[PDB]
Amino acid sequence: QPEAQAKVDVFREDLCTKTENLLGSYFPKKISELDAFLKEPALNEANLSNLKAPLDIPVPDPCGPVNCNEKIVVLLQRLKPEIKDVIEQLNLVTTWLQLQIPRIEDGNNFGVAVQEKVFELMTSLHTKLEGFHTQISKYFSERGDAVTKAAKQPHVGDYRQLVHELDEAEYRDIRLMVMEIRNAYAVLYDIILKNFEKLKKPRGETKGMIY
């Protein structure tokens, strides 16, 4: 239907332009921002003890509000937008390749295969990022469980240790996430850039006209 065609064409054009913008400009820009962030001192702290934050649980022979590790929270606040941003970009690139996939045919599947291989990598990243998104939530819930446990049972010293251990682990995991997020943006650029000709035109435009 022609009015419908206009609506479909608009989406088709929009996806194509956005992807080229993301690959052409946004991906290089993001790689730079993330590498800078890794160099930022907050991201690299030599002594994890500095990260440890106060526990007000009264050691046994009445618990005041315990507080979150602000240093972890401020880092998370920087990391969270990026993790969400990458997932959105992965969806745009996955959709773009899918629209590019041509009519199924019995041969000249190479190129369709290149499109498929890239998709596998893009899908792998999407899965990894979702895991990062999940991990962020678990930290708040897990730490909260530990502090309540520490408050409920002041006698057990280990629970207090766990709260400190969880915070340190999160800092280390966050540092890896930033590195991985930068790497994912980079690998996406390399795979899409290197095989762009097949992704854009899987079948090829040849017309021998044998038939």
């Binding site: 041969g107 000249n108 599947n109 190479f110 190129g111």
Partner: protein
């Protein structure tokens, strides 16, 4: 999946992989170098074989005299080479019987290259895994150097190296060779310099290299394999010349 078996299947993307795989084999082979000079053309090869208990009974392991006016050096599977060299010698002799004149150099190369193309096209046979440099004087084009590939594609090169570290040699040759100014003496020196860089051994053994020169003297081409004493002098002259440049530095 696998479009690389049988030598008769074009891959999507139109590449005949079995020929490409064959070309890879030549890379493992001992370096062979040919330089064209106004006076003569020279072929120098690295005798990869260095086992102490081997005997130099033959005129050369890797330089073969196809005909009075031409010679070839082979890099690649040795057995395949022996077959091609036998064929080249027959092809040349057949031209002499028919036209009673020496085979023009390009023609001998073009004919062998045609046998090499056929092996690629027909299904049963493996593509020949040899790359060979042909040097010869023909009345029509004087002194000529030609390099052949397993593909059956041949080219005329003023200087070229086939075999291990071929790329390094071509790069060195590209800066060093002076077009129109080369003389056999200078070329033999260029050969020693390039061979020294390409070969891993710090000192060319002078028993690790075979150098053969084709020159026309008195109206008859002479293909002579330089004897070891002659090569030893060349190595010494190079060692001294380079050392003098280092001493200046």
């Amino acid at each position: 999946r696998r479009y690389d078996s049988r030598t008769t299947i074009f891959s999507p993307e139109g590449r005949l992989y079995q020929v490409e795989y064959a070309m890879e084999a030549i890379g493992h082979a001992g370096t062979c170098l040919g330089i064209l000079a106004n006076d003569g053309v020279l072929l120098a090869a690295e005798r990869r074989n260095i086992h102490k208990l081997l005997d130099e009974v033959f005129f050369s392991e890797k330089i073969y005299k196809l005909n009075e006016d031409m010679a070839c050096s082979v890099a690649g599977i040795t057995s395949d080479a022996n077959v091609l060299t036998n064929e080249l010698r027959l092809i040349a002799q057949r031209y002499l019987l028919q036209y009673q004149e020496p085979i023009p150099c390009e023609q001998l190369v073009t004919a062998l290259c045609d046998i090499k193309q056929a092996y690629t096209q027909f299904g049963g046979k493996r593509p020949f895994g040899v790359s060979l440099l042909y040097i010869g004087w023909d009345k029509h084009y004087g002194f000529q150097l030609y390099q052949s590939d397993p593909s059956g594609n041949y080219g005329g090169w003023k200087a070229t190296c086939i075999g291990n570290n071929s790329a390094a040699a071509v790069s060195m040759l590209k800066q060093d060779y002076k077009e129109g100014e080369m003389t056999l003496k200078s070329a033999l020196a260029l050969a020693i310099k390039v061979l020294n860089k390409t070969m891993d051994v710090s000192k060319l053994s002078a028993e690790k290299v075979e150098i053969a020169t084709l020159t026309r003297e008195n109206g008859k081409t002479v293909i002579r394999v330089l004897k070891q004493k002659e090569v030893e002098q060349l190595i010494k002259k190079h060692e001294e010349e380079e050392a003098k440049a280092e001493r200046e530095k």
